[PDB]
Amino acid sequence: AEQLWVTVYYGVPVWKEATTTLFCASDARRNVWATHACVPTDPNPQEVVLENVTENFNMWKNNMVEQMHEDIISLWDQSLKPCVKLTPLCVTLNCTDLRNGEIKNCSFNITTSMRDKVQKEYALFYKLDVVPIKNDNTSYRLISCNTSVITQACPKVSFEPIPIHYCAPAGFAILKCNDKKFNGTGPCTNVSTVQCTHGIRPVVSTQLLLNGSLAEEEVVIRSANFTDNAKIIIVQLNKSVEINCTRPNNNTRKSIHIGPGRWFYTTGEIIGDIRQAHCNISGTKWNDTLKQIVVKLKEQFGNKTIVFNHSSGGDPEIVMHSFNCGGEFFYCNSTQLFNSTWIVLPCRIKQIVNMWQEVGKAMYAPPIKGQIRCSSNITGLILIRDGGKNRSENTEIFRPGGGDMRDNWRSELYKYKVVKIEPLGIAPTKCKRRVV
Amino acid sequence: GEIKNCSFNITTSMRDKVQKEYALFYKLDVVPIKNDNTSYRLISC
Ligand SMILES: *[C@@H]1O[C@H](CO)[C@@H](O[C@@H]2O[C@H](CO)[C@@H](O[C@@H]3O[C@H](CO[C@H]4O[C@H](CO)[C@@H](O)[C@H](O)[C@@H]4O)[C@@H](O)[C@H](O[C@H]4O[C@H](CO)[C@@H](O)[C@H](O)[C@@H]4O)[C@@H]3O)[C@H](O)[C@H]2NC(C)=O)[C@H](O)[C@H]1NC(C)=O
Ligand SMILES: *[C@@H]1O[C@H](CO)[C@@H](O[C@@H]2O[C@H](CO)[C@@H](O)[C@H](O)[C@H]2NC(C)=O)[C@H](O)[C@H]1NC(C)=O
Ligand SMILES: *[C@@H]1O[C@H](CO)[C@@H](O)[C@H](O)[C@H]1NC(C)=O
Ligand SMILES: *[C@@H]1O[C@H](CO)[C@@H](O)[C@H](O)[C@H]1NC(C)=O
Ligand SMILES: *[C@@H]1O[C@H](CO)[C@@H](O)[C@H](O)[C@H]1NC(C)=O
Ligand SMILES: *[C@@H]1O[C@H](CO)[C@@H](O)[C@H](O)[C@H]1NC(C)=O
């Protein structure tokens, strides 16, 4: 061969997988995710295809879901830091049934003029927020009394999800898998480089994925391993299913004095009949959606297998479907969607809630005045396998489930991978440097 | 005697489940109240 000599090159387009922090970006305008500090979005972002190069994607290793997990919780706690403690409101409640029982009409006597202007301030309380005192009437008190000090969320904080974007830092790039058939992992062929991702709204829910993206012209079902009962099945829907939710009760609210310079909002009277929360779901769209899902499930789980039975498994907040329409947390019985194996949902409202899990300090929602209405659609859902059974293709009871809230972002992040680019490299050449 | 066996009565149900909860205390952690029995309290008071 030729006498070869070392030549140094810079700008070499090669890279290695790496994990780092992506910068937030937002369509700039006390909403939790509406941080005062965030990069304005690019009105004309670029995307280029590699084509000579493929890349190994694995949605179960995208560490970006961890960044979102921690940052989102931090933002929640920060916005709701200067909020009102319920500590002096642990006073026992003399409760009777509210005439029309999920709502009790109770009284108490605290603080009784501890350098302030206060009184008994009777009010309405929800069953799901209190603990019975079986040694009394039965009487009630705040369920938090024997656990922790919790605060009433600041009335000035909105909880509307914001579609936050995330962009690569210098020296790093975001690769995207554009294969319509891409599942949990593999050598994605259609790979492109993206300057910055689209916005993902931090929607928090249990059992069904709401207001997300749609599948590429068919239902696509993903899992780490369809044979492993310890894994979950992620279903991305071809078209979404329409759901319309309402809180028909027109509620008032009252500010009460709890100390000098301190106020607390209580549920006031209710105007009109007291009715149940519920959501209306189109059976047509729901059933047709299931048809496509079943067809795909057959590919792995058998051609005559009975699927989709009633809700079961986990504590009440896992067994019920959960969402936060209007700022109030609704827990509805999804069984009405899965009450027939191979639509109006009854629903209750809770105010003392836990953002995915909370230790010690927790959030109590304020009462919302008026009526709550919203509209959304089911764009995905999580199925769980019921466990061991006869191998024969008889049953596989894909119950709704999933309590790991991180999957509400992983379900979108699966498209992306972050790498570190190494511009420095060498190769042989023909001649020696003309060294004197 | 370096260890005293003492009682008290606090918080007496300030929205809680409490009682007199007698316990052992060390001499070196308390201050005598020479106007009482002598009785004691936390030296940090
Ligand atoms: C999935 O995505 C959908 C669509 O984004 C969400 O549904 C919407 O949620 C927003 C949340 O704010 C609703 O917006 C509210 O509408 C109220 C009345 O709506 C009428 O009036 C507004 C006036 O601008 C019109 O834009 C609208 O079209 C209607 O004509 C407003 O009164 C609300 O503002 C008040 O409340 C907020 C509370 O934070 C205050 O800050 C304001 O200052 C003001 O007091 C608010 O704008 C919207 O109506 C919903 N759509 C529908 C059809 O109902 C789903 O919630 C989302 N699902 C999930 C799972 O996230
Ligand atoms: C859909 O998922 C299957 C199962 O994981 C993928 O097939 C495997 O891909 C891995 C990638 O490293 C290979 O090691 C296995 O040998 C593959 N298994 C078989 C039997 O082919 C498949 O590639 C995925 N489809 C897409 C489009 O990503
Ligand atoms: C609640 O009020 C009734 C009013 O007659 C009273 O008899 C009862 O003892 C009260 N309960 C409590 C918790 O004090
Ligand atoms: C996905 O939705 C489109 C909507 O027009 C439909 O035409 C298509 O048939 C659906 N895919 C399957 C697998 O049915
Ligand atoms: C789902 O709801 C959103 C709400 O804005 C709507 O824009 C979208 O078109 C809906 N999806 C379908 C498939 O109708
Ligand atoms: C609730 O009832 C009061 C009664 O006066 C009415 O003024 C108010 O508009 C009602 N609110 C809603 C949202 O219907």
Pocket test for ligand 4, best of A292, A294, A296, A299 (most atoms within 8 A of CB): A292
With contact defined as beta carbons under 8 Å apart, do A316 and A335 qualify?
no
Deposited experimental method: cryo-EM
Read off the DSSP letter of residue A239: E
Determine the distance from the C-alpha atom of residue A104 to the mean position of all C-alpha atoms in its chain, rounded to a whole number: 31
CA distances from A111 to A92, A108, A163 (A): 12, 9, 43
Pocket test for ligand 2, best of A185, A216, A227, A296 (most atoms within 8 A of CB): A185
The angstrom resolution of this structure is 5.2
With contact defined as beta carbons under 8 Å apart, do A188 and A54 qualify?
yes
A152/A395 Cα distance (integer angstroms): 46
Tokens, residue A24 = 């937030």
- Which of these, A396, A399, A401, lies nearest to A306 by C-alpha position? A396
The DSSP code sequence of A268-294 is EEEES----EEEEE-HHHHHHHHHHHH
- Residue A351 near ligand 5, beta carbon < 6 Å: no
- Beta A55-58 vs A185-188: how paired, if at all? antiparallel
- Which of these, A247, A249, A397, lies nearest to A323 by C-alpha position? A247
Q: Does B34 touch chain A (CB under 8 A)?
A: no
What spacing in Å lies between the alpha carbon of A184 and ligand 2's midpoint?
8
The DSSP code sequence of A123-192 is EEEEGGGEEEETTTSSEEEEGGGGT---EEPPTT-------BEEEPPTTEEEEEE--TT--SEEEESSEE
> Which residues make Cβ contacts (< 8 Å) with residue B38, sequence separation at least 6?
B32
Task: Mark the breaks in chain B: residue after which each occurs, C to N over 2.5 Å.
Answer: none
Tokens, residue B45 = 């008071």
Q: Which residues of A touch B15 (CB under 8 A)?
A: 87-88, 90-92, 110, 141, 145
* For ligand 3, atom 10: residue with the closest CA: A94
Residue B25: how many other CB atoms lie within 10 Å: 15
Integer Rg of chain B from CA: 12
With contact defined as beta carbons under 8 Å apart, do A164 and A200 qualify?
yes
With contact defined as beta carbons under 8 Å apart, do A402 and A48 qualify?
no
Residue A62: how many other CB atoms lie within 10 Å: 19
**Is cis: bond before A429, omega within 30 of 0?**
no
The DSSP code sequence of A52-102 is S--EEEEGGG-THHHHHHHHHHHHHHHHTSS-EE-GGG-S-BEEEEPP---
Integer Rg of chain A from CA: 27
- Which of these, A175, A59, A162, lies nearest to A412 by C-alpha position? A59
Tokens, residue A337 = 């969607």
Q: Which residues of A touch B18 (CB under 8 A)?
A: none
A15/A18 Cα distance (integer angstroms): 9
- Beta A185-188 vs A84-85: how paired, if at all? unpaired
> Tokens 């904080």 map to which residue?
A157
Dmax over Cα atoms in chain B, in whole Å? 36
B43/B28 Cα distance (integer angstroms): 9
Q: Does A90 touch chain B (CB under 8 A)?
A: yes
Cα angle for residues A234, A235, A241 (degrees, 5° grid): 140
What spacing in Å lies between the alpha carbon of A94 and ligand 3's midpoint?
6
> Tokens 């019985």 map to which residue?
A333
- The span from the first CA to the last CA of chain A, in angstroms, equals 26
Residue A293: how many other CB atoms lie within 10 Å: 22
A86, burial (CB in 10 Å: exposed 0-12, middle 13-18, buried 19+): buried
